[PDB]
Design a protein around this ligand. Structure first.
Ligand code: K
Ligand code: MG
Ligand code: MG
Ligand code: MG
Ligand code: MG
Ligand code: MG
Ligand code: MG
Ligand code: MG
Ligand code: MG
Ligand code: MG
Ligand code: MG
Ligand code: MG
Ligand code: MG
Ligand code: MG
Ligand code: MG
Ligand code: MG
Ligand code: MG
Ligand code: MG
Ligand code: MG
Ligand code: MG
Ligand code: MG
Ligand code: MG
Ligand code: MG
Ligand code: MG
Ligand code: MG
Ligand code: MG
Ligand code: MG
Ligand code: MG
Ligand code: MG
Ligand code: MG
Ligand code: MG
Ligand code: MG
Ligand code: MG
Ligand code: MG
Ligand code: MG
Ligand code: MG
Ligand code: MG
Ligand code: MG
Ligand code: MG
Ligand code: MG
Ligand code: MG
Ligand code: MG
Ligand code: MG
Ligand code: MG
Ligand code: MG
Ligand code: MG
Ligand code: MG
Ligand code: MG
Ligand code: MG
Ligand code: MG
Ligand code: MG
Ligand code: MG
Ligand code: MG
Ligand code: MG
Ligand code: MG
Ligand code: MG
Ligand code: MG
Ligand code: MG
Ligand code: MG
Ligand code: MG
Ligand code: MG
Ligand code: MG
Ligand code: MG
Ligand code: MG
Ligand code: MG
Ligand code: MG
Ligand code: MG
Ligand code: MG
Ligand code: MG
Ligand code: MG
Ligand code: MG
Ligand code: MG
Ligand code: MG
Ligand code: MG
Ligand code: MG
Ligand code: MG
Ligand code: MG
Ligand code: MG
Ligand code: MG
Ligand code: MG
Ligand code: MG
Ligand code: MG
Ligand code: MG
Ligand code: MG
Ligand code: MG
Ligand code: MG
Ligand code: MG
Ligand code: MG
Ligand code: MG
Ligand code: MG
Ligand code: MG
Ligand code: MG
Ligand code: MG
Ligand code: MG
Ligand code: MG
Ligand code: MG
Ligand code: MG
Ligand code: MG
Ligand code: MG
Ligand code: MG
Ligand code: MG
Ligand code: MG
Ligand code: MG
Ligand code: MG
Ligand code: MG
Ligand code: MG
Ligand code: MG
Ligand code: MG
Ligand code: MG
Ligand code: MG
Ligand code: MG
Ligand code: MG
Ligand code: MG
Ligand code: MG
Ligand code: MG
Ligand code: MG
Ligand code: MG
Ligand code: MG
Ligand code: MG
Ligand code: MG
Ligand code: MG
Ligand code: MG
Ligand code: MG
Ligand code: MG
Ligand code: MG
Ligand code: MG
Ligand code: MG
Ligand code: MG
Ligand code: MG
Ligand code: MG
Ligand code: MG
Ligand code: MG
Ligand code: ZN
Lengths: 53, 141, 110, 181, 83
RNA sequence: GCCCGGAUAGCUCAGGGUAGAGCAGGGGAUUGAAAAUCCCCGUGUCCUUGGUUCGAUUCCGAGUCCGGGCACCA
RNA sequence: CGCGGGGUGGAGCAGCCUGGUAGCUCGUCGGGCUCAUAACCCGAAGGUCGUCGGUUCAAAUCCGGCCCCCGCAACCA
RNA sequence: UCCCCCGUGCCCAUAGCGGCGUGGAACCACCCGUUCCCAUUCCGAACACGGAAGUGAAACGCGCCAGCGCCGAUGGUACUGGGCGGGCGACCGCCUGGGAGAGUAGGUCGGUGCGGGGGA
RNA sequence: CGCCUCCUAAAAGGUAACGGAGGCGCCCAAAGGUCCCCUCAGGCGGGACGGAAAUCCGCCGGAGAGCGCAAGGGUAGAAGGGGGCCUGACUGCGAGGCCUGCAAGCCGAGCAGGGGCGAAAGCCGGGCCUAGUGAACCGGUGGUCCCGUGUGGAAGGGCCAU
RNA sequence: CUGACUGGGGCCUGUAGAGCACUGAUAGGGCUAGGGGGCCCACCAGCCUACCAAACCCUGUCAAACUCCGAAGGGUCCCAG
């Protein structure tokens, strides 16, 4: 981790629950991360969006 | 004076000194040689002293072969210090030398010139020595 | 010194043999196509087929599918059903693919 | 395939003269042309522009074949060169497109070189291949001074199956390569 | 009593020992999951019924008996033979 | 994390109907000159995006960056 | 081989921190003004950064050895 | 059962480099084409497809050669587990069991399993 | 002063000194998954600008290159380079082990859910590997709807995640 | 009855010794890219080195952090005492 390499949560875009923790380099990757990930609540894969940790 | 031009590591752990010399036990170049009978760390200063002695006897003539090289860094702490605080600084270089090693050879000179020059050289050495002459045993190696 | 051909052939064969299956190995010449199902643990070919043995001719692809069915036909006879396909140095395409499609059509499991 | 004058000349004129010149026992022993590789090592377009375009568009007109970019293998400070910068165009001409370009290279291009006094005989590979260098791209008929923007030259590699320079020089002179000496 | 000042050494660090090496030798009975070799890179290679983890650790896939095999230029392999 | 603010020409700073002024720089007038002086001249998405209004520096939102302040620290 | 700081045009100082760009004042040289000099005004040149070695695509700049030069310390016995 | 070729293993250079000789009926390759499938950061070179006029030139297969590579004894030595001595030391020596590396002689231009095509 | 690599370390493991030398307190949205393809450094000869070194061609070349950064190990029969599609840098578990005073640290087949790549066999629970780290207490935030001091709520807690 | 220790058998190892194939060091000689040295040239060459200068070749060596090699031993498992 660092000031430019920030921790972040991934929020299921369909039930709004944060499901994963990870990082990115926000200078190299300014856009919000969007990744398909399995949501335990929706018991199915879903688009997940970065939010502030 | 002799010493390595470069080195991987500045300081070596101290030797052991067992066993007859590993190699360089036969006359390879000249006619007569000087043989170590006991082991020792021969310093660069000892070598340079045995060498000059043989030059000033050959009055710039003949050939001199030096077949030992001081590659082993020799370390000493500054005077009056206590033990510890790391290894002392390198103050000189020695050549490990074990019984049977031909350290010097000469040629281009009479048998009487070489025997005397090699005798003087051995007085510069911290060990007993022995003068040898190139035999067929040498040339068979 | 290896060529890309030999590097490729090792590359795919190494991966297949790790799975432990019987290996349906395919060799393709400019004229003929040959198949033999191989036990690498015993080092023994169990069953074979080829246009040269079956004395077939015509469309190389259409002939390739035929040896596939022919190899399968004899394979089911001796109990062999599951198998791993070995395209060796070949792309999974055309003649090799047709032979592969043929063997499945005849009942080999891969 | 199709009919190009140089190709038909290679079989009709140059192959029998080669056999009777060297005594080839096999018909595949006699030297063949293999490929023509054209190299514009630009480096002007390192970062100063993507002028690679206007220079590949002209390579595409000269050879009929779209060039491919070459990128810097290592980084070099003196060259102001970061690893991976697009620093050239190379195109491999084979078969009929090789003949058509070689045919025009001899018939119109090399004569259009000013102070031309023949190709260097010493530039043979040592192993039967040849290389030459051009300083202008408008030496070729498809390029006009109005269509140009900056003079760029090239390296031309002609590869043959001849094992020796001696065989290859006979192959290229018989085809019509004017050698200076 | 004069006491001469002393300098210091810039060294004196070493890392924990990692306990690497072979963990089950040829002829030993092992159970699926047993660790066989701790290693850096593929000093030994996984043979028959032996897996390899992300840190090159070799481990048995079946109950059975360990066997080693030196394949020359192909490398040293560890096998597990079924019982 | 929260409240308060700024970004406007190269530097400084003023600002629902304009894009401003000073200094830096350009020559020109001046002396012996260093200037002061006198003159004219340039140098902007007013940080970015939506939205307002007939209009956008303004007003709003939202983020970017840099200012201040507050509280905290297991 | 106790601990610090420093070495870069001719002199005295930036640049090193944060690797890519050598800068400021004087001095030096060519012109000008003066009867002449100084001052003053207009131009210009000169530094491969103590050294060897390493890292790096690239070292005055970062790291290790050596050379040189200033500063501090050396207490309880 | 034996010879040749094709495919696929195993031993992991006694199997390699180089020099030479040799093979196209079959098999393999190159080859003839680039319509079709598919393909080139450009290129039918590669990958791929459709073919069968030609050539074993390249590749490959098989042989012969010890120049290089590779293997390599026997004997002797170094060292050493255990047992004993010696020297102020640096270090040395004996008994018993084990025993290299280098080097010498020498060997090697592969050997073998399974299947398929062909042959006698 | 913690962590990693090498040596010391006496051919298992472990092994000390203010012993000999270095490194870490990050990084990567691909530098991750999978499928398909490709093979370096350097030597020599050849080629406009072009040099020791840019890009191009031939020959030789088993790895001396490369693998983000120290070192060691490993490695082209790829772990190195290129491309396509993608997010397994999964959720719920976990036989069996390595290591080890504790606590921690490490490797892990296989089952299920819902997926990625592939024709398939299969691979995928980040990264060739070994540093890139901090027990508990106290508090923040999202969720869960488990407790809610006569009762319904609420205040405040608990649990999961960070 | 599984123990210390011991017999046999398999696997693991990189020390002693040795070696120089890798990383470095290194003595003598030969052949030699960059020159100094320099009768000298810059009109464009050169040319000669009883000197330093990679690579290669021959002779000869050194290394805890070098290894093409490599023991005695040591460890561990099985069977037996
Ligand atoms: K006192
Ligand atoms: Mg990330
Ligand atoms: Mg749940
Ligand atoms: Mg965020
Ligand atoms: Mg000692
Ligand atoms: Mg030694
Ligand atoms: Mg002494
Ligand atoms: Mg000492
Ligand atoms: Mg000392
Ligand atoms: Mg000490
Ligand atoms: Mg000796
Ligand atoms: Mg004496
Ligand atoms: Mg005598
Ligand atoms: Mg010898
Ligand atoms: Mg048919
Ligand atoms: Mg077919
Ligand atoms: Mg195959
Ligand atoms: Mg003919
Ligand atoms: Mg065409
Ligand atoms: Mg020539
Ligand atoms: Mg023209
Ligand atoms: Mg050729
Ligand atoms: Mg005292
Ligand atoms: Mg005292
Ligand atoms: Mg006293
Ligand atoms: Mg220190
Ligand atoms: Mg320690
Ligand atoms: Mg430890
Ligand atoms: Mg330790
Ligand atoms: Mg350690
Ligand atoms: Mg082990
Ligand atoms: Mg794994
Ligand atoms: Mg065995
Ligand atoms: Mg087995
Ligand atoms: Mg100075
Ligand atoms: Mg100065
Ligand atoms: Mg500074
Ligand atoms: Mg800077
Ligand atoms: Mg200056
Ligand atoms: Mg002047
Ligand atoms: Mg007068
Ligand atoms: Mg004056
Ligand atoms: Mg100036
Ligand atoms: Mg320094
Ligand atoms: Mg610089
Ligand atoms: Mg006091
Ligand atoms: Mg029979
Ligand atoms: Mg074969
Ligand atoms: Mg065979
Ligand atoms: Mg030969
Ligand atoms: Mg023939
Ligand atoms: Mg042949
Ligand atoms: Mg034929
Ligand atoms: Mg014929
Ligand atoms: Mg078409
Ligand atoms: Mg041939
Ligand atoms: Mg031989
Ligand atoms: Mg051997
Ligand atoms: Mg031997
Ligand atoms: Mg023996
Ligand atoms: Mg002895
Ligand atoms: Mg003994
Ligand atoms: Mg011992
Ligand atoms: Mg013992
Ligand atoms: Mg003893
Ligand atoms: Mg005694
Ligand atoms: Mg004494
Ligand atoms: Mg003894
Ligand atoms: Mg003894
Ligand atoms: Mg004995
Ligand atoms: Mg004995
Ligand atoms: Mg031997
Ligand atoms: Mg003998
Ligand atoms: Mg012999
Ligand atoms: Mg021999
Ligand atoms: Mg023979
Ligand atoms: Mg041989
Ligand atoms: Mg034979
Ligand atoms: Mg064979
Ligand atoms: Mg077999
Ligand atoms: Mg057979
Ligand atoms: Mg038959
Ligand atoms: Mg037969
Ligand atoms: Mg502590
Ligand atoms: Mg720590
Ligand atoms: Mg150990
Ligand atoms: Mg170790
Ligand atoms: Mg243990
Ligand atoms: Mg203790
Ligand atoms: Mg250090
Ligand atoms: Mg440190
Ligand atoms: Mg992404
Ligand atoms: Mg990585
Ligand atoms: Mg990919
Ligand atoms: Mg050249
Ligand atoms: Mg060039
Ligand atoms: Mg690198
Ligand atoms: Mg680094
Ligand atoms: Mg490597
Ligand atoms: Mg890609
Ligand atoms: Mg998709
Ligand atoms: Mg998931
Ligand atoms: Mg467990
Ligand atoms: Mg534990
Ligand atoms: Mg850890
Ligand atoms: Mg599943
Ligand atoms: Mg699946
Ligand atoms: Mg599918
Ligand atoms: Mg599947
Ligand atoms: Mg799994
Ligand atoms: Mg990767
Ligand atoms: Mg507390
Ligand atoms: Mg709490
Ligand atoms: Mg909440
Ligand atoms: Mg409730
Ligand atoms: Mg209540
Ligand atoms: Mg109520
Ligand atoms: Mg209730
Ligand atoms: Mg709470
Ligand atoms: Mg709560
Ligand atoms: Mg018992
Ligand atoms: Mg026991
Ligand atoms: Mg024992
Ligand atoms: Mg030793
Ligand atoms: Mg060496
Ligand atoms: Mg040694
Ligand atoms: Mg050693
Ligand atoms: Mg050997
Ligand atoms: Mg031990
Ligand atoms: Mg034992
Ligand atoms: Mg044992
Ligand atoms: Mg028992
Ligand atoms: Zn959800």
């Amino acid at each position: 981790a660092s000031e430019v390499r920030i921790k972040l949560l991934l929020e299921c875009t369909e039930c709004k629950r944060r499901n994963y923790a990870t990082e990115k380099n926000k200078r190299n990757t300014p856009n919000k991360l969007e990744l398909r990930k399995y949501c335990p609540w929706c018991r199915k894969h879903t688009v997940h969006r970065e939010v502030k940790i | 004076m002799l010493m390595p031009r470069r080195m991987k590591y500045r300081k070596q752990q101290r030797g052991r000194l067992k066993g007859a010399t590993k190699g360089g036990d036969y006359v390879a170049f000249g006619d007569y040689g000087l043989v170590a009978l006991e082991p020792a760390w021969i310093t660069a200063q000892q070598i340079e002293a045995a060498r000059v002695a043989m030059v000033r006897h050959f009055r710039r003539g003949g050939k001199i072969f030096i077949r030992i090289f001081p590659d082993k860094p020799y370390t000493k702490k500054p005077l009056e210090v206590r033990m510890g605080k790391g290894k002392g600084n390198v103050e000189g270089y020695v050549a490990v030398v074990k019984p049977g090693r031909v350290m010097f050879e000469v040629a281009g000179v009479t048998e009487e010139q070489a025997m005397e020059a090699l005798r003087i050289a051995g007085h510069k050495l911290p060990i007993k020595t022995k003068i040898v002459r190139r035999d067929a045993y040498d040339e068979a190696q | 010194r290896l060529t890309a051909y030999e590097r490729r052939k090792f590359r795919v064969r190494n991966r297949i043999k790790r799975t432990g299956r019987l290996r349906l190995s395919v060799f393709r010449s400019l004229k003929h196509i040959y198949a033999q199902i191989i036990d690498d643990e015993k080092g023994v070919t169990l069953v074979s087929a080829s246009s040269l043995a079956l004395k077939l001719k015509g469309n190389k692809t259409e002939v390739a599918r035929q040896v596939g069915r022919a190899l399968a036909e004899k394979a089911l006879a001796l109990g062999i059903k599951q198998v791993a396909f070995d395209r060796g140095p070949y792309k999974y395409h055309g003649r090799v693919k047709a032979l592969a499609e043929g063997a499945r059509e005849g009942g080999l499991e891969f | 395939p199709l009919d190009v004058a140089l190709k038909r000349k290679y079989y009709e004129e140059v192959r029998p003269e080669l056999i009777r010149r060297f005594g080839y026992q096999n018909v595949w022993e006699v030297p063949r042309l293999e490929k023509v590789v054209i190299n514009q090592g630009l480096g002007e377009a390192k970062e100063d522009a993507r002028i690679l375009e206007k220079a590949a568009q002209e390579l595409a007109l000269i050879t009929g074949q779209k060039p491919a970019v070459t990128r810097a293998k290592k980084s070099i400070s003196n060259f102001k060169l970061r690893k991976g910068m697009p620093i050239g165009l190379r195109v491999t001409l084979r078969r009929d497109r090789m003949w058509i370009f070689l045919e025009k290279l001899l018939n119109v291009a090399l004569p259009r070189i000013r102070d031309f006094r023949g190709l260097n005989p010493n530039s043979f590979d040592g192993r039967g291949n040849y290389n030459l260098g051009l300083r202008e791209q408008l030496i070729f008929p498809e390029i006009t001074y109005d269509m140009v923007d900056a003079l760029r030259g090239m390296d031309i590699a002609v590869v043959t199956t001849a094992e020796t320079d001696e065989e290859a020089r006979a192959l290229l002179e018989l085809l019509g390569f004017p050698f200076r000496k | 009593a004069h006491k001469k000042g002393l300098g210091s050494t810039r060294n004196g660090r070493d890392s924990q020992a990692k306990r690497l090496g072979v963990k089950r030798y040829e002829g030993q009975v092992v159970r699926a999951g047993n660790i066989l070799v701790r290693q850096r890179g593929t000093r030994f290679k996984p043979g028959k019924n032996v897996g390899m983890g992300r840190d090159f650790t070799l481990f048995a896939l079946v109950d059975g008996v360990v066997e080693f095999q030196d394949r020359g230029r192909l490398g040293r392999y560890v096998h597990v033979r079924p019982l």
